């Protein structure tokens, strides 16, 4: 802990810097808690025996915390910077440091007593506000300033600091602060808004009165006696001891008698016995299943319900060809005659008109579609057959068709038609999009994607998707008797006949093909057999439910993803064509089958095989037992596929149960030998198996309404209802050894709460309840009623909807929540804390919760959703916030602290290594819970919450929780309808009143419920309870480990991580001998196994889906930590990467398409696969835009080709390398600098839309969506009539829009009255995209509508935007870097990325296979904790209304506002005037426009190989696994000697002497090299061929003087230059011109000219330096001369409309000629700490051609050691200076008192003041040194939480005593691990040189001086006031 290394870490560039704030937290074990003895008395305070002063104790909180930092002499602001006289010259910093490179560093520390990011961010912002302006003022008047600013803020939780540190110093600081804050508080300003909110909430809580008596009445078991008796009485001890002993002996006996530890068999015998038992169990299951079924041996049927046809698509057309013959369409008749009649009727005249036009479906020209009805009179036989149309299978069925289908099948062979209509229509758009990056990489990847699209599988899937879209469209028409509809598929010779229904739940269709254009077939045999008709081939009226439609639409964009992902995972090159590996056909075929055949209970087997395969990772003491998965596999079978899957699964189980997975740690790493695919016979590595358990995964939110799934849901909801204990005794009143299905022991709950509370109170400092209460009161008291969770779901279920058939033949139609806030705002309420006072009473007058149900269709996941009513949400939101607040400050929970998801597992390894010695062994168990819902009686939650509250909340929480013990649930009306015509057979009887059941009333349309928490509602209380339980488990395990089985003590650390349901335990030990390892492994095995039996006490039932006692692997949520290797299932997000999403505006879909891609990249995928996924995403986005439905797609394609702007349908594709890295904003930025888009945006910002009040003004109305901006024609869409009608029912005058423009002040301040609240509601109801139309139909049709409607409407007619071509001609009525930066607030990072990206334009690399696993890094891209910048909207609120939403300051506020004005032309400082000039029509469009103009991309946690890392490394490695992508020593010593001479104490003449001699002796490479900084070096070295062109070319900086002003003589002898001159120059290829003028006291800048504008922000400071050289002020104004880009005052940016300062008028041909300078007047110069090569252009006026300043990262030591071994350099205190190492200190002891030297003067005294550096290694404070006797923190220990001692069961003790176990024979076999040399667990985790050199350049100056200062004294020198002999050293020091 020293300041020198810390300040040496940071490197700064010229100017002022603030860096980036970073957040460090607690990782290692907290030290501290010493003997604390605080006694306040007269002399102050006392601690231990050291006494501190009282008023010093008033500030010890900061002095002690930073004792090792402030050791300087307390300089001032004036002493370092030039005087500004602005009052701030007396601003005293906390540490002002100036290292030997002039890099000024001002740092101030702070300490807050908060507990979250809130106080941290607050302190950071207030420190920045305190110290912003003076330092900027001082840096504005310096020559070459390099000043850094840093802030340090600490808290008991974490530390926020912009200067990089190491976790050790963070831990030191945090624990020091803990001690300091403790002694501070034992020894003993907010704003106004929060000060009002706290009182507003406290008043309500103090006067809140819930009717506890009516509550006890209307609710079963709500009694305050339970709560008070739980809080008051302590916890029993003897009961717990006997219960633990009983549970322990029971678990031990169960383990022994379940894993065959009796009596003596070896491992192989136990394994064969296990194999026999598994065989028996599978045999029994098969027999019991086959016994109840129609026993068959062959079932002729199919699996794919569609016929295999592969036509060659012809020219596109939507019309039925007529000339077909009929010579054979009457062979069969009953189907052929139907098609014959159809063709004959459509031929001549029988068709009719049915228009299905987009504008209808959204419920609002030639875009209208034409469909044909039908009425063909069929014969009686065929009519009867059609009216006729429209048992569980056996495990032994000989399903071999599926078998040999997955072996040989033409599924991946190339369909020879790869250049046809559809492929052209896609590839053209693809090439147009990719034209931005025309490298070889992009061409290769596009060719690979097209080759993939050419395979016959996607060719078959394409027309299937077309058919599915057409059917979804035709789903809801009008049905005539005997009607039909004939349609063509617009790309293929296929015809479909459709017969819709009225139920709108399925459909009937029949296909037909010409039988002469069927080119190929999929040559399978699981396919629906068609029929022959001569020259035709037809189908037989299948039926497809409406639920199984989206999966048919999304078929190509999942087949492509599967093909690409599996082709890459196998290890094939994405740019090298090969054959199908015959191990790849299986995976693709299986994906195809599981996708097409879409049911539950079929993919469920595959998603369940994981828990079966998750065995074999079990440790020798136990055996792999997959037989626990029998059950959940029973039930009926209804497909030929389920039988095959079940047989293969059972075979995999019996294969696994015979031998586990091997475990061989060859080198220091560990692996696992034998793995294999689940449904196959294979052998693949881990990563190939892990994400094979996720074959049939997908997501949706469509709200399926099939009666079957809804019935299963209703069944699941009521399962444990009848299991009520029927006794209000064991539900929170007394203890119980064996608890029943819903009971829980109270004393154990109290013990767990006490344990967790002690852990919390030890991590944070005590007296924490107060901080929590204030935090909760604040966070509640600020919730306005308007900013609620609008657009959510509510329930219109009241008492009236309780009698079926009395309210039926109606629709429920659940509604939104906005209506509630509307009808509340009407009633005069503003704050959320006001509505609850009546919402609670309104609820209590009822007797239920009025819950409604909701179910999506995703076959698995989080399917159920329980929507509530507003009166319940309003009371639940006030309690869930308290729950989340109490949960946020826990050390285990991972749903409020999300980052801990990836910290408590990795870092554990380091922890294990810390207090164990390297070489430990892990023992892990990943648990779960069986029924996390329907098993938690809601009283335990209330108790465990009220235990953590300050008692001002007890009554409110008790009431608001007591509302969950009688809830009513709605049901579908169609459900009861069809039901009133097994479990369902009981439900119908309960409904009809025959059989009495205890939930459903007779005749009533609901379901009662008394037990079970709802899912999603009480999300955090469950996590809190689980945290308590897991903390108790951790304490108990630490206890049992503290004392061995026989009085010994095994050593080991425990870790506990847990979220909502899933949880893990990660114990780790270290043995020494061989036998002790065995004993400890057995002990920890029993310990970990006891959890299953210890769980039921807390009302938690562990399932059979949890592994136990695995050696070197865990699994928390979905990621598997296989030792130092982390595996994540990437198929999950890949499959769920293209979800249909209904948003009312374009350019908002690509946002989500990029979000999902970024999520997939996070999940982990080489960029070469992310790019293909993006191509498939583009294909999906275009197919969902009318690619195969509307016939007018050619016109839209032609329009988009000539207009690449998004929001019109165009899709932007990222760079091949670094594809999904940065979000959509990056692609937008990159496209806005190369395409015509840069033009279309420029017009939006540089047009004053007056236009003489023409008919071309405003152009596209400003309207931003998401991050992008577009025309208001799109964002205005959507029905809102219900909402505005409701508003008109209230006091909303129609003038409101106009009435808003008269006073915009109501759009930024919150509220003052009721009326402006209504105005804010009205603006809320129109802007973002809030909808009101009911989802009365499907999604795909109405999405295609919402697309094509807007597209067409913009293409031809108006809205107020113009046509496409009209706007294109309005163009002829791009961006400059200023506005480009103001738009994208992260342009610099984008530029860095792009620069690093413009080197991989070729395909060059090697296939080097590295070691087993390159342990990667944890790289984070652009990402900050909170923020530092002011948003582009707050400046307007401040300038326009005076609200200091930002706190910059008058100078800085003016500067940034002026920059903003210079960014937007029309923008003025008048809120009313800015409407009649800028593109807008109302003063509301601008409010929405400005709040989303600037947007930043999202963060990315990408992994990269180490070297610690960079982005170039990641791009080298991560492009493809197993593949990389790629394209002196005198310079170092020269840099070192240059830095040591320039900054060294010398004289300028002597400096130049030594420099030129060093240049003479040394050599250098020629300048035909890389030019970053050595260019200048080799130039100034070769200045001793022809230098003129050397400086001219190769990016120099020079320029003559074309027009000298004049010469004039001031009588004080001054050569002044007066008049008007013209200077010219050529710096970094600009050829600028500078007109200058001055006639009074000095000169001033007149005008500047530039030939280009790329490098603008650097030319500005270059011109600043040039004027500083030639000495010209830049303060006075000028007379504007032309149409300038911008103007500049004080080297600052000013707009052109202001005409304030010198204007920079860029003219490409402004000035093109050079000055032809003479090469003889060239000199070298050496200023203090500055090297220059210059030329005198005029008499007394010089010009610096080139400059140099040495960095601090070039102070070498090898070069120093070499220079030491040299004598010829007569150049070398100097000897001990350059070469760090008769005497030196003896002569200069008195040389400072009398100046007698021929060398440096003051510089030597400034340098030698560094004795404080060597004095920094010692001489600390007293309390800072006496308190180093602290021992580490031992642990939590249940003898403390329970306050008593506890004995334990010595079963294993007496067993090993008698010898009934023979442990040494159980583990014989499997390898030994105590002596195995392995690396520690965990995967993830210039300081070196800078620290070394900063600690190094001290000794070589004060070696013997330190010895003298130690010899003279060692104890009194620690004090500074005590000395106030060795007058020479003190003089050297100071004074
Ligand atoms: Mg598992
Ligand atoms: Mg788990």
From Swiss-Prot:
CC cofactor note: For endonuclease activity. Binds 2 Mn(2+) ions in the active site. The divalent metal ions are crucial for catalytic activity. For polymerase activity. Initiation activity is stronger in the presence of Mn(2+) than in the presence of Mg(2+).
Effect on the protein upon substituting residue 1061 to A: Complete loss of polymerase activity
Result for mutant: residue 513 to V: In strain: SPL057A
Binding site for Mg(2+): 1062
UniProt effect for mutating residue 110 to S: In strain: SPL057A and Isolate AH12/China/2010
Regulation: Inhibited by Baloxavir acid (BXA).
Pfam families listed in its UniProt record: Bunya_RdRp, L_PA-C-like, L_protein_N
Record's subcellular location: Host Golgi apparatus; Host endoplasmic reticulum; Host endoplasmic reticulum-Golgi intermediate compartment; Virion
Entry's EC annotation: 2.7.7.48, 3.1.-.-
Residue span(s) of domain RdRp catalytic: 912-1107
Effect recorded for residue 74 to A: Drastically decreased endonuclease activity
Keyword Transmembrane helix: no
Region (Endonuclease): 20-195
GO biological process assignments: DNA-templated transcription; viral RNA genome replication
CC annotations in GO: host cell endoplasmic reticulum; host cell endoplasmic reticulum-Golgi intermediate compartment; host cell Golgi apparatus; virion component
Stretches for region Cap-binding: 1593-1708
Remarks, miscellaneous: Classified as His(+) endonuclease since it has a histidine upstream of the active site that coordinates the first cation.
Oligomer and partners: Homomultimer. Interacts with the glycoprotein N; this interaction allows efficient polymerase packaging into virus particles. Interacts with nucleoprotein N.
UniProt record similarity statement: Belongs to the Bunyavirales RNA polymerase family.
Written domain comment of the UniProt record: The N-terminus contains the endonuclease activity (endoN). The central region contains the RdRp activity. The C-terminus contains the cap-binding region.
Protein name: RNA-directed RNA polymerase L
Origin species: Dabie bandavirus (Severe fever with thrombocytopenia virus)
């Amino acid at each position: 802990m020293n300041l020198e290394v810390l300040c040496g870490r940071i490197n700064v560039e010229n100017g002022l810097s603030l860096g980036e704030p970073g957040l460090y937290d607690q990782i290692y074990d907290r030290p501290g808690l010493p003997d604390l003895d605080v006694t306040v008395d007269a002399t102050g305070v006392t601690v231990d025996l050291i006494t501190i002063q009282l008023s010093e104790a008033y500030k010890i909180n900061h002095d002690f915390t930073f004792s090792g930092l402030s050791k300087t002499t307390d300089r001032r602001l004036s002493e370092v910077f030039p005087i500004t006289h602005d009052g701030s010259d007396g601003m005293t910093p906390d540490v002002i440091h100036t290292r030997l490179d002039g890099t000024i560093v001002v740092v101030e520390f702070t300490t807050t007593r908060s507990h979250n990011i809130g106080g941290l961010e607050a302190a950071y912002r207030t420190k920045i506000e305190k110290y912003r302006d003076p330092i900027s003022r001082r840096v504005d008047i310096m020559e070459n300033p390099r000043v850094f600013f840093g802030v340090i803020v600490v808290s008991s939780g974490g530390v926020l600091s912009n200067m990089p540190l190491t976790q050790d110093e963070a831990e030191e600081l945090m624990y020091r602060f803990c001690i300091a804050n403790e002694i501070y508080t034992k020894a003993r300003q907010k704003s106004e808004e929060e000060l009002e909110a706290i009182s507003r909430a406290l008043s309500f809580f103090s006067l809140f009165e819930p009717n506890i008596e009516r509550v006890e009445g209307t609710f079963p078991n709500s009694e305050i006696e339970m709560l008070e008796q739980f809080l008051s009485t302590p916890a029993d001890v003897d009961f717990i001891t006997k219960t633990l002993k009983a549970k322990e002996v029971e678990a031990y006996a169960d383990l022994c008698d379940s894993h065959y530890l009796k009596p003596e068999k070896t491992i192989q015998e136990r394994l064969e016995i296990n194999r026999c038992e598994a065989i028996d169990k599978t045999q029994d299951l098969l027999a019991g299943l086959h016994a109840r079924s129609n026993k068959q041996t062959s079932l002729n049927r199919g699996t794919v319900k569609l016929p295999p046809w592969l036509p060659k698509p012809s020219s596109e057309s939507i019309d039925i060809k007529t000339d077909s013959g009929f010579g054979s369409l009457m062979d069969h008749g009953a189907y052929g005659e139907l098609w014959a009649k159809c063709l004959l009727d459509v031929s001549l005249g029988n068709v009719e008109g049915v228009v299905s036009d987009p504008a209808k479906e959204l419920d609002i020209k030639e875009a209208k579609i034409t469909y044909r009805r039908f009425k063909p009179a069929l014969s009686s036989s065929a009519r009867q057959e059609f009216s006729l149309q429209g048992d569980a299978l056996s495990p032994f069925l000989d399903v071999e068709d599926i078998g040999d289908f997955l072996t040989f099948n033409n599924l991946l062979a190339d369909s020879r038609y790869g250049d046809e209509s559809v492929q052209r229509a896609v590839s053209i758009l693809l090439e147009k999009a990719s034209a931005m990056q025309d490298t070889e990489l992009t061409h290769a990847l596009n060719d690979s994607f097209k080759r993939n699209l050419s395979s016959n599988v996607v060719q078959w899937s394409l027309w299937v998707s077309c058919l599915a879209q057409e059917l979804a469209s035709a789903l809801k028409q009008h049905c005539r008797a005997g009607e039909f509809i004939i349609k063509k598929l617009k790309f293929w010779p296929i015809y479909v006949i459709i017969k819709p229904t009225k139920s709108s739940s399925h459909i009937f269709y029949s296909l037909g093909i010409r039988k002469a254009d069927v080119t190929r077939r999929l040559t399978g045999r699981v396919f629906s057999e068609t029929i022959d008709a001569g020259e035709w081939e037809l189908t037989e009226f299948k039926s497809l439910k409406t639920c199984k439609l989206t999966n048919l639409v999304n078929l190509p964009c999942t087949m492509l993803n599967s093909i690409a992902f599996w082709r890459e995972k196998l290890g094939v090159a994405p740019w090298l064509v090969r054959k199908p590996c015959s191990e790849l056909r299986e995976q693709v075929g299986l994906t195809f089958l599981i996708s097409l055949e879409d049911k539950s209970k079929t993919e469920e087997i595959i998603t369940l095989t994981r828990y079966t395969q998750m065995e074999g990772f079990v440790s020798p003491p136990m055996l792999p037992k997959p037989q626990k998965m029998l059950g959940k596999l029973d039930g009926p079978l209804r497909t030929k596929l389920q039988v095959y899957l079940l047989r293969k699964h059972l075979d995999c189980m019996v294969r696994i149960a015979s031998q586990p997975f091997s475990l061989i740690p060859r080198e220091g790493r560990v692996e696992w030998g034998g793995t294999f695919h689940a449904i196959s016979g294979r052998s693949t590595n881990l990563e190939n198996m892990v994400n094979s358990w996720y074959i049939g995964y997908y997501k949706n939110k469509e709200e399926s309404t099939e009666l079957n799934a809804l019935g299963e849901m209703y069944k699941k909801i009521v399962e444990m209802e009848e299991d009520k204990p029927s006794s209000p005794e064991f539900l929170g009143w007394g203890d119980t050894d064996s608890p029943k299905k819903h009971e829980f022991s109270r004393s154990f709950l109290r013990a767990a709460c006490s344990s967790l509370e002690r852990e919390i109170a030890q991590r944070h400092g005590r007296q924490w309840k107060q901080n929590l209460e204030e935090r909760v009161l604040r966070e509640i008291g600020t919730k306005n009623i308007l900013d609620l969770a609008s657009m959510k779901a509510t329930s219109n279920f009241s008492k009236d909807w309780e009698l079926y058939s009395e309210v039926q033949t109606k629709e429920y139609h659940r509604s939104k929540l906005l209506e509630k806030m509307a009808t509340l705002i009407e009633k005069g309420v503003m704050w959320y804390i006001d509505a609850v006072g009546q919402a609670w009473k309104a609820v209590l007058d009822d007797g239920c919760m009025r819950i409604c149900l909701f179910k999506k269709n995703q076959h698995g996941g989080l399917r159920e959703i329980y929507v509530m009513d507003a009166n319940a949400r309003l009371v639940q939101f006030g309690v869930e916030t308290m729950a989340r607040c109490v949960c946020e400050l826990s050390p285990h929970e991972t749903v409020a602290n999300p980052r801990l998801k990836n910290s408590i597992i990795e870092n554990h390894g380091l922890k294990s290594a810390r207090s164990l010695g390297p070489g430990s062994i892990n023992i892990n168990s990943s648990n779960d819970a069986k029924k996390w819902n329907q098993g938690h009686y809601t009283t335990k939650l209330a108790l465990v919450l009220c235990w953590f509250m300050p008692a001002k909340f007890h009554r409110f929480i008790w009431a608001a929780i007591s509302m969950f013990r009688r809830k009513k649930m709605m049901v579908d009306l169609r459900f009861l309808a069809h039901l009133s015509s097994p479990f369902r057979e009981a439900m119908t009887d309960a409904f009809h009143g025959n059989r009495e059941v205890s939930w459903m009333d007779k005749g009533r349309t609901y379901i009662k419920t008394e037990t079970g928490m709802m899912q999603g509602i009480l999300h955090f209380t469950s996590s809190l309870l689980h945290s308590c339980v897991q903390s108790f488990y951790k304490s108990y395990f630490v206890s049992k480990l503290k004392e061995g089985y026989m009085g010994e003590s095994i050593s080991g650390v425990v870790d506990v991580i847990e979220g909502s349901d899933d949880s893990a335990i990660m114990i780790s030990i270290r043995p020494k001998s061989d036998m002790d390892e065995v004993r400890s492994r057995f002990f920890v095995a029993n310990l970990l196994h006891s959890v299953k039996f210890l769980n039921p006490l807390f009302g938690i039932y562990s399932s059979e889906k949890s592994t136990v006692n695995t050696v070197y692997c865990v699994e928390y949520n979905s990621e598997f930590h296989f030792h130092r290797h982390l595996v994540r299932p990437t198929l999950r997000w890949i499959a769920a990467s293209h979800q249909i999403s209904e948003t009312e505006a374009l350019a908002s879909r690509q946002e989500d398409y990029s979000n999902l891609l970024t999520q997939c990249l996070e999940g982990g995928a080489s960029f070469s696969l992310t790019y293909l996924i993006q191509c498939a995403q583009l294909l999906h986005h275009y197919m969902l835009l009318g690619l195969c439905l509307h016939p007018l797609f050619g016109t839209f394609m032609g329009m988009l080709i000539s207009d690449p702007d998004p929001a019109l349908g165009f899709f932007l594709m990222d760079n091949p390398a670094f594809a999904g890295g940065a979000g959509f904003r990056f692609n937008l930025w990159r496209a806005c600098k190369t395409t015509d888009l840069g033009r279309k945006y420029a017009y939006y910002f540089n047009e004053i839309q007056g236009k003489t009040k023409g008919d071309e003004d405003y152009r596209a109305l400003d309207a931003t969506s998401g991050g992008t901006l577009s025309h208001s024609v799109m964002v205005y869409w959507g029905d809102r009539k219900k909402y505005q009608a409701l508003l008109n029912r209230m006091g909303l005058p129609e003038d409101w829009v106009e009435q808003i423009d008269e006073n915009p002040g109501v759009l930024y301040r919150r509220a003052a009255n009721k009326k402006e609240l209504l105005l804010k509601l009205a603006e809320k109801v129109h802007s973002p995209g809030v909808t009101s139309s009911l989802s009365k139909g499907h999604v795909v049709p109405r999405v295609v509508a919402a697309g094509v409607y807007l597209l067409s409407r913009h293409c031809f007619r108006f809205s107020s935007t113009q046509k496409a071509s009209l706007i294109k001609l309005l163009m002829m009525s791009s961006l400059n870097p200023n506005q480009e930066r103001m738009l994208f607030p992260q342009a610099q990072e984008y530029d860095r990325v792009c620069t690093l990206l413009e080197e991989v334009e070729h395909l060059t690399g090697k296939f080097v296979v590295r070691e087993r696993n390159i342990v990667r890094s944890r790289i984070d891209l652009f990402q900050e904790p909170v923020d530092l910048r002011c948003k582009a909207e707050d400046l307007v609120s401040e300038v326009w209304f005076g609200l200091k939403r930002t706190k910059l300051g008058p100078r800085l506020l003016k500067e940034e506002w002026d920059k903003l004005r210079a960014s937007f032309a029309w923008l003025s400082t008048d809120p009313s005037e800015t409407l009649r000039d800028g593109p807008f029509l109302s003063h509301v469009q601008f409010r929405n426009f400005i709040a989303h103009v600037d947007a930043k991309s999202r963060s990315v946690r990408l992994l990269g190989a180490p070297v610690v890392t960079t982005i170039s490394q990641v791009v080298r490695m991560n492009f493809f696994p197993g593949f990389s992508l790629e394209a002196l020593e005198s310079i170092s010593i020269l840099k070192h000697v240059l830095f040591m001479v320039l900054n060294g104490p010398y004289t300028e003449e002597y400096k130049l002497e030594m420099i030129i001699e060093a240049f003479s002796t040394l050599v250098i490479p020629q300048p035909s090299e890389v030019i970053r900084k050595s260019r200048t070096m080799t130039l100034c070295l070769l200045s001793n061929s022809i230098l003129d062109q050397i400086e001219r070319a190769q990016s120099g900086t020079l320029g003559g003087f074309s027009k000298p002003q004049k010469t004039f003589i001031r009588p004080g002898g001054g050569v002044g230059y007066k008049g008007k001159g013209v200077w010219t120059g050529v710096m970094e290829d600009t050829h600028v011109q500078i007109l200058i003028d001055g006639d009074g006291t000095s000169n001033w800048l007149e005008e500047i000219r530039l030939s280009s504008d790329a490098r603008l922000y650097d030319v500005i400071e270059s011109i600043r330096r040039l004027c500083d050289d030639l000495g010209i002020n830049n303060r006075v104004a000028s007379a504007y001369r032309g149409h300038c880009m911008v103007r500049l005052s004080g080297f600052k940016i000013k707009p052109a409309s202001r005409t304030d300062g010198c204007p920079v008028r860029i003219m490409e041909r402004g000035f093109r000629i050079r000055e032809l300078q003479n090469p003889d007047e060239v000199k070298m110069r050496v200023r203090g700490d500055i090297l220059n090569l210059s030329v005198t252009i005029q008499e007394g006026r010089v010009m610096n051609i080139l400059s140099y300043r040495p960095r601090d990262t070039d102070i070498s030591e090898s070069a120093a050691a070499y220079l030491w071994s040299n004598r010829d350099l007569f150049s070398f205190p100097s000897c001990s200076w350059i070469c760090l190492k008769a005497s030196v200190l003896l002569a200069n002891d008195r040389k400072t008192q009398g100046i007698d030297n021929r060398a440096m003067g003051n510089i030597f005294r400034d340098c030698l003041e560094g004795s404080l550096r060597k004095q920094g290694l010692m001489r600390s404070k007293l309390t800072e040194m006496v308190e180093k006797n602290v021992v580490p923190l031992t642990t939590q220990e249940l003898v403390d939480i329970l306050e008593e001692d506890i004995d334990f069961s010595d079963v294993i003790a007496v067993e090993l005593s008698e010898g009934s176990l023979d442990i040494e024979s159980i583990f014989d076999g499997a390898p030994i691990l105590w002596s195995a040399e392995v690396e520690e667990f965990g995967e993830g985790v210039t300081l070196m040189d800078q620290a070394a050199i900063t600690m190094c350049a001290i000794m070589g100056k004060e070696g013997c001086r330190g010895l003298l200062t130690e010899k003279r004294c060692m104890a009194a020198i620690r004090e500074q006031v005590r000395p106030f002999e060795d007058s020479i050293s003190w003089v050297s020091d100071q004074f």
